[PDB]
A paper describes a structure:
The 12-kDa FK506-binding protein ([name]) is a ubiquitously expressed peptidyl-prolyl isomerase with considerable homology between fungal pathogens and is thus a prime candidate for future targeting efforts to generate a panfungal strategy. [name] proteins all catalyze the cis/trans isomerization of peptide bonds N terminal to proline residues in polypeptide chains. In addition to its role as a [name], [name] is a member of the immunophilin family and is the target of the immunosuppressive drugs FK506 and rapamycin. Three extended loops, which have been called the 40s loop (between β2 and β3), the 50s loop (between β3′ and α1), and the 80s loop (between β4 and β5), surround a deep active-site pocket that binds both FK506 and rapamycin.
Another clinically important and often antifungal-resistant Candida species, C. glabrata, contains a glycine at this location, suggesting that this protein would not form the intermolecular interaction. To test this prediction, we determined the structures of C. glabrata [name] in its apo and FK506-bound states. Examination of the packing revealed a close contact between the 80s loop of one subunit and an adjacent molecule in the apo crystals. However, here the 80s loop is not inserted into the active site of the neighboring molecule. Hence, as predicted, the C. glabrata [name] structure shows no evidence of an intermolecular self-catalysis-like binding event. Strikingly, the C. albicans and A. fumigatus [name] apo structures all revealed the deep insertion of a proline located in the 80s loop into the ligand-binding pocket of a neighboring [name] subunit. This interaction was not observed in the C. glabrata structure, which does not have the corresponding proline residue.
Numbering used by the authors: 0 to 114
The structure:
Amino acid sequence: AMSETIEGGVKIDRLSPGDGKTFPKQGDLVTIHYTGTLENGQKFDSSVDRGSPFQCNIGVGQVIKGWDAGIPKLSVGEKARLTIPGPYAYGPRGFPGLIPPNATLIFDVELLKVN
């Protein structure tokens, strides 16, 4: 149960452990189940509610910076909270009506798989 502050002011809180050995590296495909929330409790996205996970390549700019920085510090199976500041998330614009300008996003993510 580390808490870790990393590039971007991104905070990783470890909720439940992974294998402690299998971590994603740049380029790796990662399969994630997540839930995204605003600082005010408002939920804004959830792969769990959709019944199917999210896949992406990591550290190639295909997801928010906070995930490129954050996901690779998790081990397979690990469940963690990422607290990602605006610049590492949707930025100074956000998506108006959904995500406020420069909003801090809280993600509860579980790394399910690395390839």
